[PDB]
Design an enzyme around this catalytic site. Structure first.
Site, short mmCIF file in Angstrom:
data_model
loop_
_atom_site.label_atom_id
_atom_site.label_comp_id
_atom_site.label_asym_id
_atom_site.label_seq_id
_atom_site.Cartn_x
_atom_site.Cartn_y
_atom_site.Cartn_z
N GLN B 11 0.83 -1.20 0.00
CA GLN B 11 0.00 0.00 0.00
C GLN B 11 0.86 1.25 0.00
O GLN B 11 0.57 2.19 -0.73
CB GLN B 11 -0.89 -0.03 1.25
CG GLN B 11 -1.80 1.20 1.29
CD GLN B 11 -2.34 1.48 2.66
OE1 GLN B 11 -1.99 0.84 3.65
NE2 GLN B 11 -3.28 2.40 2.69
N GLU B 62 -4.27 -6.79 -1.20
CA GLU B 62 -5.64 -6.36 -1.10
C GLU B 62 -6.08 -5.81 -2.45
O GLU B 62 -5.34 -5.07 -3.07
CB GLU B 62 -5.88 -5.50 0.13
CG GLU B 62 -5.38 -4.12 0.03
CD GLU B 62 -4.04 -4.02 0.70
OE1 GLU B 62 -3.35 -5.07 1.07
OE2 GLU B 62 -3.66 -2.82 0.94
N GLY B 135 3.00 -6.49 5.68
CA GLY B 135 3.09 -7.89 5.26
C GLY B 135 3.49 -8.00 3.80
O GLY B 135 4.45 -8.67 3.51
N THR B 136 2.71 -7.39 2.88
CA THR B 136 2.91 -7.62 1.47
C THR B 136 4.09 -6.81 0.97
O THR B 136 4.70 -7.20 -0.03
CB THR B 136 1.63 -7.33 0.68
OG1 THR B 136 1.87 -7.61 -0.70
CG2 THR B 136 1.20 -5.89 0.75
N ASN B 197 8.82 8.12 8.26
CA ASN B 197 7.61 8.91 8.19
C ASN B 197 7.64 10.10 9.13
O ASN B 197 7.23 11.18 8.74
CB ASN B 197 6.41 8.01 8.42
CG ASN B 197 5.99 7.36 7.09
OD1 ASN B 197 5.20 8.01 6.47
ND2 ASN B 197 6.36 6.14 6.62
N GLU B 245 25.66 4.60 -11.63
CA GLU B 245 26.69 5.41 -10.99
C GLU B 245 26.71 5.38 -9.46
O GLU B 245 27.76 5.47 -8.96
CB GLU B 245 26.45 6.83 -11.33
CG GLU B 245 27.49 7.90 -10.98
CD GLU B 245 28.98 7.72 -11.28
OE1 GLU B 245 29.78 8.36 -10.64
OE2 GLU B 245 29.31 6.87 -12.13
#
Lengths: 426, 428, 426
Positions: B11, B62, B135-136, B197, B245
């Site tokens: 996501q 999902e 997870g994904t 984040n 590079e």
């Protein structure tokens, strides 16, 4: 041929040197836009002494302008005769030596001397063969007295045999600004007696007397005061630039008026000096000129010469004039004032006649004297120095920039012996 | 010709990719339909009448976030089978992403990548965008990179991991997923760039003065970093830099490829009013230690190799003047064995601003990607979290029942322990 | 006649060489479309040294443009004077050596060298007998330092007795791009000390210094830096293309500069170089040329020449000038600054006078000097190399790609021997 490199330090030096570039400009007929006007050969024959050709026909001064604040440099370029200078001859400082001799000589001047010595070498080595250098600065200030005296030491190391003729303006006798006067004066003099060939001293109190009593000006500005000093500063080097019956240079004056190497501090005077009203009334003669010349009230040094003896003295006359009255009046004054001359140099007087007078007069004279009455300055600065040093006032800025206490004791000792050696021959 | 293939997994990968492909479309002036009214060939392909399709794949387990792209404004920009969606979520499980549900979509993904890469030779490399907290993003990210390493061996593989923050988490099982991912992306990636984040949260609080930012504000800033990275491929410049590079110039040892990024200036539209954006000051703000994009203060490390991408009205003499000041600044520390530690790259094209965004139109910008030894603490900090949770086997039964064996925790931990000792040995 | 085959390698080499062909086309009067304008015999009589007739009356350069990355060759084609080059002389690559000397030399350089060597042989065998080859490249990159030095090795095997001049830029001392500079530089030097006849060193940082303090250009782009290098490139080869009083070609320069075959690294200088403001102030004469050429401030290498001794030096003058001041000023510079020349060589200086100055000037000079102050650059690269090699840093990009560990030790040994040979003469 012969060239003089003119090197300017400090706010005082730059305002005095702005008027040199006014009085030499109009005597040689140079337009502030660069060009020449006046259609006479005699101005143009000997112009390389102060100017350089710029392959546009314009003349750029051989002037080195150095200060630690850009503020007086803004004043120079904005004014009249301000477009004349090459901008690369301008070198700036950004911080400013706040009337500290230490940061003028050691701290702030260290990063700038490398730049300004580069500009002097471009001008010095750039010619055929140089004659000498001439310096205008102060002793009371930081950026004139600190960085200007460092330059004198550095340039003497490169050019030992060339002459040095310097105007330093001294601390005032009666009332003086800039509370660190003796710290700036005494620290400068002990390096100036070892590195300068001729120094002729100017006092602001002396110029206040002259402009009040002789010029009769009600409101003398420093525009007017610097104009008077610049008139005499043209007069000492005039005979290099114009031909004459009896020629003289600065080296002619150097060999003749300094009998021993330690004592080379001079008095300057100028004549004629009459007010605006009395231009039409005064009879311009060589006998009247010599009477005005041997007066304490003409002198640009705030000393009484009648308290001591003129060791050696010289008069550079200018104008188309008869030489007998030049020579016989110099004999007359030596016979009349027996006690005002020293005995064991007979016929102490030097005369030189240059044929082209300054603009607006018909005859003029510029007077230098090596007097032993200059003890009044050196004793007055020394006891002001000794009073302020005994209880260590204001020392911690000068110790703060990397001096020691020992350099102050040497500075006093080097100048105290200069007082005694004048007294020895009095 | 020379092109690069973007892979977006998870996501986080998709939403960053939505912002990334909005910037790429606007800078080349192609409309959301896909046709403009050949330098840009590195990111868009050619489909017949003037029309361009992106060289990307979107992967998610999902259906939710990929169907929302399919019904958005960019319906016809993307090829319909570049957006792959499965049926059930990986659900914050590393083991689910590899062993249970991951194998059913990787085969379809590799078919799309092969068809998209065999148009030309001179494929420059791969860009991966993923979250290691999920997870994904973490599980299927590894499975794709194991598969890509076997087929496309010598090609350069850059990874952009949206790394878990020290303080803000949005997951509890993310220390497990992060340590397992780092073990398995160590031997699969060439260059991994660390994005955090809460680092971009604090940047947008002080520089953009946005008090309450969202993920859409974060992803614009990430998109500007990627644009500045690959600007040299797209536009002509005084000194260009390739994708290949970076690995010769930034990564001194095979295991040490974990970096820290920065962008400057990030200035608001009101904030641009009062400021000269000089080359000297945009490079000062890049090295300003609070203005990292990874939440690792580089006072507690030594810089090892650093790469600066200037973009815009940048003269080369002011680059040389600006980088000399940085080297002589004594609070910035370099490692002893790397005396020269800079690569500069200068491009002509100024950064493009998205309308209705929060950035201002700027004439010049810097993107800095550096290797430092300060990344030792970001691996130690999860290692403190990992031991505190694995010591009495919390959340383990979700992983072991799902198809992996107990012991892969232990193997991943010792691999991370080996990496921590490697960073300590390189600094001394 | 005699011909120079030009080989242009890397991004740096292509844009230095693109502006080289701009200045030579301008001095021979070639329109960018390939026609001639100017109606003068002296421009056109010796044009086969750099150009080829194309039976449509257009002149095409004898240049081979070589790169592994198709970006920079598109830039050269799209620019002005880009339609001059033959399209077959472009040899593209697809992958690009990512500042890796290994992939420049061994792995990706090998599959393109067959393509470029075919084109060089087509040009080389085409004439009666060619004189030599000149290469412009960079040593801090991958495709200039790796594949350019491979070409030097292959062409020296084929044509062993022809001259080989290299205009190579080196890593800059102070702040420096492309973090693996010392790996690329050291590996390229030992392949260039054995296979090049004369190597002329350029630094970017020295060129930035020139454009700041002499040219006073506020924003120097790489267009302006390349223009300065192209000026020196034309000055080495003036005598081939134009008549003169004392001619000197490239082999004349080689026999007269290098006493031992191992030491052939030269410092390059150009004079005059004045700002727009100071153009109109200067006397453009042979004494002024010789003062400006002997400055540390003028040399296009970042090696201060006063820290060493000039082993042998040469000055290629251009213009209508008098040959005794060409001779006497070269005597003057040896005598006055006597400490900077080596003792066991009498009369170290070579002069050549060409009669055609560059366009818009009246007199110019290019300086090529073999100094032992270039030891300072090789020590700076060598200690940076030994810094990184002891820790095996960045080695797996080189060692994994098809070289061995022993080639690095050989590269350091060969460059340390070059350091030792310089030290024995100073």
């Amino acid at each position: 041929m012969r060239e003089i490199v003119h090197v300017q330090g400090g706010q005082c030096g730059n305002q005095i040197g702005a008027k040199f570039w006014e009085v030499i400009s109009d005597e040689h007929g140079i337009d502030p836009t660069g060009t020449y006007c006046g259609d006479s050969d005699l101005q143009l024959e000997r112009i390389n002494v102060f100017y350089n050709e710029a392959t546009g026909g314009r003349f750029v001064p051989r002037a080195i302008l150095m200060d630690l604040e850009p503020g007086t440099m803004d004043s120079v370029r904005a004014g009249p005769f301000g477009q004349l200078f090459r901008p690369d001859n301008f070198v700036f400082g950004q911080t400013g030596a706040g009337n500290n001799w230490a940061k003028g000589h050691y701290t702030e001047g260290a990063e700038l001397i490398d730049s300004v010595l580069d500009v002097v070498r471009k001008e010095a080595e750039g010619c055929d063969c140089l004659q000498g250098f001439q310096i205008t600065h102060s002793l009371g200030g930081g950026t004139g007295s600190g960085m200007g005296t460092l330059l004198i030491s550095k340039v003497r190391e490169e050019y030992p045999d060339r002459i040095m003729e310097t105007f330093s303006v001294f601390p005032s006798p009666k009332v003086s600004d800039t509370v660190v006067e003796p710290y700036n004066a005494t620290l400068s003099v002990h390096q100036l007696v070892e590195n300068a060939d001729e120094v002729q001293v100017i006092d602001n109190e002396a110029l206040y007397d002259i402009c009040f009593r002789t010029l009769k000006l009600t409101t003398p500005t420093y525009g007017d005061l610097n104009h008077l000093v610049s008139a005499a500063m043209s007069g000492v080097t005039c005979c290099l630039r114009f031909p004459g019956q009896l020629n003289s240079d600065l080296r002619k004056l150097a060999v003749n008026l300094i009998p021993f190497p330690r004592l080379h501090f001079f008095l300057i005077g100028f004549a004629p000096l009459t007010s605006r009203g009395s231009q039409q009334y005064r009879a311009l003669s060589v006998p009247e000129l010599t009477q005005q010349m041997f007066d304490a009230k003409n002198m640009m040094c705030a000393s009484d010469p009648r308290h001591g003896r003129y060791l050696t003295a010289s008069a550079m006359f200018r104008g188309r004039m008869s030489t007998k009255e030049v020579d016989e009046q110099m004999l007359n004054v030596q016979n009349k004032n027996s006690s005002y001359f020293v005995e064991w140099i007979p016929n102490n007087m030097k005369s030189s006649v240059c044929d082209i007078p300054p603009k607006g007069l018909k005859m003029s004279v510029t007077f230098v004297g090596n007097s032993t009455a200059i003890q009044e300055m050196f004793k007055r600065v020394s006891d002001q120095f000794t009073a302020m040093f005994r209880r260590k006032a204001f020392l911690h800025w000068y110790t703060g920039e990397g001096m020691d206490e020992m350099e102050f004791t040497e500075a006093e000792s080097n100048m105290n012996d200069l007082v005694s050696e004048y007294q020895q021959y009095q | 010709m020379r092109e690069v293939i973007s892979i977006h997994v998870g996501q986080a990968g998709i939403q960053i990719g939505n912002a990334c492909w909005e910037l790429f479309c606007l800078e080349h002036g192609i409309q959301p339909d896909g046709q403009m009214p050949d330098a840009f060939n590195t990111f868009f392909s050619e489909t017949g009448a003037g029309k361009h399709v992106p060289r990307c794949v979107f992967l998610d387990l999902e259906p939710t976030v990929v169907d929302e792209v399919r019904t958005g404004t960019y319906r016809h920009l993307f090829h319909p089978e570049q957006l792959i969606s499965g049926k059930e979520d990986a659900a914050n499980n590393f083991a689910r992403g590899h062993y249970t549900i991951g194998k059913e979509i990787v085969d379809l993904s590799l078919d799309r990548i092969r068809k998209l890469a065999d148009n030309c030779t001179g494929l420059q490399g791969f860009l991966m965008f993923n979250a290691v907290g999920g997870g994904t993003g973490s599980g299927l990210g590894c499975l794709l990179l194991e598969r890509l390493s076997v087929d496309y061996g010598k090609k350069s593989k850059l990874n952009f991991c949206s790394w878990p923050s020290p303080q803000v988490s949005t997951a509890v099982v993310e220390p497990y997923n992060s340590v397992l991912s780092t073990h398995s992306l160590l031997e699969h990636t060439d260059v991994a760039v660390m994005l955090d984040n809460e680092a971009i949260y604090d940047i947008c609080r002080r520089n953009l003065d946005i008090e309450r930012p969202t993920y859409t504000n974060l992803n614009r800033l990430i998109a500007q970093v990627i644009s500045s990275l690959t600007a040299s491929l797209r536009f002509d410049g005084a000194l260009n830099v390739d994708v290949t590079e970076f690995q010769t110039n930034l990564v001194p040892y095979p295991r040490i490829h974990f970096m820290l990024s920065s962008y400057a200036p990030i200035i608001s539209a009101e904030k641009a009013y009062h400021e000269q954006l000089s080359v000297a000051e945009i490079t000062n703000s890049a090295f300003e230690p609070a203005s990292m994009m990874a939440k690792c203060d580089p006072r507690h490390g030594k810089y090892m190799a650093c790469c600066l991408m200037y973009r815009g009205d940048v003269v080369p003499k002011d680059v040389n003047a600006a980088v000399a000041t940085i080297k002589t600044k004594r609070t910035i520390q370099f490692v002893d064995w790397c005396p020269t530690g800079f690569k500069c790259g200068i491009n002509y094209q100024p950064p493009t601003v998205v309308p209705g965004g929060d950035l201002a139109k700027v004439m010049r910008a810097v993107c800095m990607i550096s290797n430092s030894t300060a990344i030792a603490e970001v691996f130690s900090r999860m290692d403190h979290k990992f031991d505190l949770m694995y010591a009495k086997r919390a959340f383990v039964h979700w992983y072991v029942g799902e198809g992996m064996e107990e012991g892969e925790f232990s193997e991943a931990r010792e691999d991370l322990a080996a990496l921590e000792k490697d960073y300590e040995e390189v600094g001394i």
